Amino acid sequence: TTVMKFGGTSVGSGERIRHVAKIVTKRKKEDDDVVVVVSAMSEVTNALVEISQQALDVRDIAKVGDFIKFIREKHYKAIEEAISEEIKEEVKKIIDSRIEELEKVLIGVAYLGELTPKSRDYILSFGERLSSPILSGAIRDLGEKSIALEGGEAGIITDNNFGSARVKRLEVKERLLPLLKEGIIPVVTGFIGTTEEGYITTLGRGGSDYSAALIGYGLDADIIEIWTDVSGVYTTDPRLVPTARRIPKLSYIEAMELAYFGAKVLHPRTIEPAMEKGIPILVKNTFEPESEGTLITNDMDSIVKAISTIKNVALINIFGAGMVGVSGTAARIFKALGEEEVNVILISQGSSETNISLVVSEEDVDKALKALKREFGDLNNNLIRDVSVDKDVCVISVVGAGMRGAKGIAGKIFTAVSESGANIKMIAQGSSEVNISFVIDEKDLLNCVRKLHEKFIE
Amino acid sequence: TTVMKFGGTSVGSGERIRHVAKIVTKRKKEDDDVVVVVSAMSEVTNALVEISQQALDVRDIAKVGDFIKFIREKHYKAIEEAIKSEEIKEEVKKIIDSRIEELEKVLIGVAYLGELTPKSRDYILSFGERLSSPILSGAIRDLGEKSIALEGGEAGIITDNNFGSARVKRLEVKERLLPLLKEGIIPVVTGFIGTTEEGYITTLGRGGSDYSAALIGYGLDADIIEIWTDVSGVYTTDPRLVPTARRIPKLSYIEAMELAYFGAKVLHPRTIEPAMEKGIPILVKNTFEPESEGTLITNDSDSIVKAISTIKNVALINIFGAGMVGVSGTAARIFKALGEEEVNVILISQGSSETNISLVVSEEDVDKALKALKREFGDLNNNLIRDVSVDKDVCVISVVGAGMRGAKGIAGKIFTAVSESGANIKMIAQGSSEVNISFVIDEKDLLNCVRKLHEKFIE
Amino acid sequence: TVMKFGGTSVGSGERIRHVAKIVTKRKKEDVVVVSAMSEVTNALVEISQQALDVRDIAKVGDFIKFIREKHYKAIEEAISEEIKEEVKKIIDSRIEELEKVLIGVAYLGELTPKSRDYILSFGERLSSPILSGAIRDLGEKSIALEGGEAGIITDNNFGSARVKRLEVKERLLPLLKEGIIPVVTGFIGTTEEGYITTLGRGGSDYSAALIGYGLDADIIEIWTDVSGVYTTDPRLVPTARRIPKLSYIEAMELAYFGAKVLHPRTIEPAMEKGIPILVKNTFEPESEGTLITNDSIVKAISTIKNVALINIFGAGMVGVSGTAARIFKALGEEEVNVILISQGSSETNISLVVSEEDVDKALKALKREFGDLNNNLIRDVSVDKDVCVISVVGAGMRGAKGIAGKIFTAVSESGANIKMIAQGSSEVNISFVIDEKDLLNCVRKLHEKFIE
Amino acid sequence: TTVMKFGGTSVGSGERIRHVAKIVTKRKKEDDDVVVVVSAMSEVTNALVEISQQALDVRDIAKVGDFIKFIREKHYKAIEEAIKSEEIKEEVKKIIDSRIEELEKVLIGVAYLGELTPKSRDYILSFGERLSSPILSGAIRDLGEKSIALEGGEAGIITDNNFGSARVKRLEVKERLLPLLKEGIIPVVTGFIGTTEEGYITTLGRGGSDYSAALIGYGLDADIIEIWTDVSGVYTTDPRLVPTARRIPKLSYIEAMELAYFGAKVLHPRTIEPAMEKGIPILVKNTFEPESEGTLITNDMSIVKAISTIKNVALINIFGAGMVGVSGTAARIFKALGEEEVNVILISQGSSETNISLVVSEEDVDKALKALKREFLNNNLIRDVSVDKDVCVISVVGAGMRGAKGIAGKIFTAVSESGANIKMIAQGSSEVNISFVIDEKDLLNCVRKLHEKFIE
């Protein structure tokens, strides 16, 4: 069986929805059983995120009806351009019903001045709940029968932890397999699940790709297709190297090491379940359906495969004599960053144990600076002597499964970096010699990636 | 003001105590103000540890009586060999006799009750230095200079009550010692020990004597701290591994810090810190080779790579995670789990995928770590750590040097060399201060690597 | 003068107008605090829960229409078209606020302690303006406020808010310099950020007192449907006469948990600054009434019906074994109120009394604290259901030899066996426990002998 | 089988030890199986307490040598008085010396290290009983019966690890003593102490020598437990207060416990519990009047049995705003006094619950005041703290008081007539005890009055 995910851009308008359905229908004639996972229409989640704060703060009753008319029109148009007056009618009722529902809650949070995380998750869920019926209708508007379902209905049962729910148990087989055994293409809302007692929950960032992975995992599928707006994964950002090419084949392991925080396509949560059961992931371009795309797979003669970059980040060094194991000073650093919700991109601590270096995003520096002040306070008194911060810095990451055991490669990567005129500020390579991460000045980003790419990829 | 510290081997016998007395006297002629810091005679601190546990466990007074006879002899012979003057010789003997009597009662005490609390554990170890110092002080008086012996607490080291590894609370070194110096007196301070508000003796821990010298120096604003040992300064690497290893003439505070790995021989970060803060140079000298120029640890001039440190037989732990990102404080909980369980972590690296953390610990701590980790998480549908892996029989090399900062090419040159040596790099950690590069290779390739590395970057 | 009016005192529009003339009569010599109408606060509670559980669209609509015509007819028979106008809308607005808040909880399905308190306040905000109205109608100037506007600053603790600051004179004085009577909706207070809080049961009295405290007022009047504090419950003894003068400390000792007229919290502020409290009947304003202020032996006899007597027996229960601490610890959680405590010189057992609907609650609590001589440190607990508390009260008893002897002999002669005795160090109150069968004969005898 | 307990005064000298041995011997003609629980000789436990304290503080070696000289001279004197036989005298002296040497060691130890752990504190205390035990065992031997001295733990009393006042964990009493009793051997067990699971000596606390007898009796299903003291049973009321005070011939388990205020001489609640549980009778007898009939605590049972008194005590009133049951206000009062270990003699709370009234020993007032404020108008919630220090507790005990209408009235009128004002009353559900407090000066005329009207 084939599970097929599409995101917000791919279902950006009625036209694109109709095009998605065409893609779906085409695959259905090659594969009997097809489950489609669908995101909210582009820029709907965000519209939803802000009215939620709009209702809580400014609290205007009309500003809500103003938002309602907007979603109404946005999706009314999609129905007109995706779909047959017959199907147009049934879908229009589903849409009206969800919109009535949506209005109420917003009116409620306005009236009370209260937006609990439970309420917050209910709002966001409407995005995908208004997308899926329109797609389902379009599938139906061609050859195949199709129904739309919520993540709960689909068998994704979660925590009570709203906004970022953990999945307890998958009941994917029980709900979908009967519907598949009957010919139906179920179109499942991505990004959302339910709790035992019926409450609607969201799955955080990368959620739709995650739902695709869970469904794929539960049904023990033959393949999971992540349909996006680029032709798979490139060897490096084409905005930096114009001659970059699609990677035909990636190992889960390699895909994992490329799936950094804030990456557009790859995420560890989507990859891990597919890796566990050995299910292939295929990244495809809905705007270029014929492209071979990137296959993330189990089997695997290259050394370096890809070069990922994280631009505009900051470098934080924590100085402190002692800082030696007899004191859980590291434990306290990360707690102070744990609270305050500061994401640590790289950690590096050398032999002396007198300092640890970290890279965070440049909007988190001051956030994490006051955090470390609150935990420690700044010889005869405390244990952090000094903190250092380097702004406008960047993380380059060289990835390839063939790097493991390959004597000499680090030497080559770094000699190259130097040959391009870049000074290495920090290096971090973990025990699975599959990823070498390092830090250089932003000025040198462009010339350094050009060289590495020229030397190691092409 | 010159602080001069002497360890166990430099004061390991009477002859030796007299030798370090002449060194102290010789510097007293160039520099008017000298404070000395001395450890117990070699083997003594160890001997005191064994008798403690023995008195607790077997509980035999005859063995205590025996131990006292060993201690008395050793120190009597020392006096008889350090000091020519009979009148001085009797003053020191007097002091020693007090301490033996006091030490005996504690030991008989612990045998009788079968209770060895940390407090008593510290009071006992204390006797090591409280028996050396008066002899060194005697040998100095014997040579013509005014001198008396003091305990660390008596000299201004006021500490926490955390016996065994006490933290320093107040530094009152200027209050006690300066009046002594002004009279022309060489105070000799028992290194490694402090005191508490109520006057309970405490110990400072591993490298305590060195720490005492640093505290005196910091407290006084000494012109120089001199650490006298049995080797001629800091070497470019372990001479056992490279026979043609040379003494580093000059070293920076950061370099020294970066060379002072946990469990190191001469350098410790506790010691280097106070000196760094007030900009007091540190000089490491050889007591048995007092002509060597040794290693000056000062402010900062050319050199890329200065030294290579090594850490034999450690272990590499990789923790593969479910997400392990900035929304789930997994890193916080890892280091907390190993904090409790008292597990010291030598290296850390986390790559940009944020999906794994690699750390190296000591190979006796592996089992402690795995148990500790399994306690905090307990190993798709179950927990937040996917799996943990371990590599035994590995080692850490660190290349250290201030000139490496901004030295485009050096990291490339180092790792290519390592590779040329016939070695695969298992993990890299280099920090924002481009002064140290640490990596991990198999124990198999330690010797070959350090040889090649030293030949190409030092000599 | 701070006159307080309650639920049944403002029961209908007539009642409100009757109340309105009373205040007008007071003003001739020289601040009025008001509660809500009868069974209105009890209704808001049920509609709150209604709108949380069933959250029914039709079942809410009928509620506001109820309190529409409840208050619409209250305007009819309480109030000239000068003043009838500025209540209709002045209450329609407050209703559509309540309706929106109510439909607010109906849509979201979440009732915070904050939302509850905001809902509960409406009761008083629906009653107050109407009274303010009939004060104007009778030719006297009047304004209707709100606890917070009057300066009752409270905790963040919704339902039972601890008072933190008082802006007494600072908000009320200028209105008094104008001839306006401030008609203040009591029971409710505020946060520093304007969020309405409630004070708990016996709150409208507290509010009245708090006004008195900060102003250092001349008098505090509590207007109810009984002619003051009686010598005993008149429903049991028909010969029960009213108490004219009651000591501060005496009124406190006559106030048990769940009592009607008196309240220790409300008594407290008045006892501090030394402000008299008068209680008078609204159905008979001519009556003398009880005056709580700063002779004779026994003053009054209070009674608590339908209680239970737990007895905790354990060998040990001494000093180092702090199970006394744990009995109450278990009873503190599970929200169990203890009426009486006794422990003899042996320290082996402790006797308590609680409402006889708390036993199973209190037992389970005790069992989840001790494993119930080689096991736990408590041997056994025993209970006596259908039992009652009688308390004799008088400051004249303090240092008066004989009264206790005589009291218990009087009890004896009524045919009653005493199960438990507790007398505090102040000697103002004597409290003992007897079978329920005996309560009627016992109180009558006691009152027959020591009051009349 | 019979267990027989003797206290410090009853073995206050060697002659008295022989006298006890004579008592134990006489009893062994009647009952074939007797076990004896013995305390330390009079004044020895006290001597041990202040010396082990002394060794901690002054750390004076010479003052230890005096204590041993003292203890040795006391017990050698005792041995020579109690025993006639030279060979027994010889073997008892050898025991006593080995024990005293052990004592010296530990006392030296505490002085040398300046440390007195609760564990060591217990080991030292255990010596008093370990020194008197073998003298008495020897004394029985000299009179013709087979006997061994045993430590409480060797007898099967296994306890906590909470030194100084341990709780019992298991009884191996039957396993240890039954093979001895089947051979005419009189085990004399050191009262007051027991062992830890890993063989560490622990003490049982105040009244712990009586409790030993009880634990033995429980563990052996004894037929009779005998507490031998220096008074002919338990009196109706303190003899020092009423001259013509008679011995109470019989007492119930429940009456016995109401008479046992924390500090009482003979009766202790913890001692009564086991005997109550298995229905084993307790007989209290007079070692200096062996012909008395004493007081029997028992099952099988006109109105008021006894008047109990607690002298020179104090009472505290806790006035507060609201102080309702809704909040955990009462809990915190007792937690506060739980820490700093303050014993509450009486508690009282009226229907107002605005105040609570407790009684504590007068030498705890400040020790209770400070700790209360350290736990805690509009600022706090506890308003006042009144206090007296010129008071006592009187408690009238009788089983036949329950359901006896009018007795409380009769009692408080009697108090009233004697010339005393009642400051507080407390009566429990089990109407076996009415406790109350009056001015100290009134105790004499009050107790005398109560005794007149309600005893004979």
Ligand SMILES: C[C@@H](O)[C@H](N)C(=O)O
């Ligand atoms: C994110 C991806 O799945 C989607 N097609 C998009 O680009 O919006």
Ligand SMILES: C[C@@H](O)[C@H](N)C(=O)O
């Ligand atoms: C600093 C060192 O790691 C690197 N070779 C550089 O200078 O760029």
Ligand SMILES: C[C@@H](O)[C@H](N)C(=O)O
């Ligand atoms: C450690 C050093 O200072 C000492 N002299 C030694 O050789 O032991």
Ligand SMILES: C[C@@H](O)[C@H](N)C(=O)O
């Ligand atoms: C660095 C590491 O990835 C590789 N095995 C090397 O030694 O070059």
Ligand SMILES: C[C@@H](O)[C@H](N)C(=O)O
């Ligand atoms: C509370 C009281 O004042 C009111 N009149 C009532 O009886 O309801």
Ligand SMILES: C[C@@H](O)[C@H](N)C(=O)O
């Ligand atoms: C005196 C005494 O009998 C009574 N209880 C009193 O009021 O003090």
Ligand SMILES: C[C@@H](O)[C@H](N)C(=O)O
């Ligand atoms: C037990 C007896 O010897 C002791 N004198 C007492 O009366 O308590």
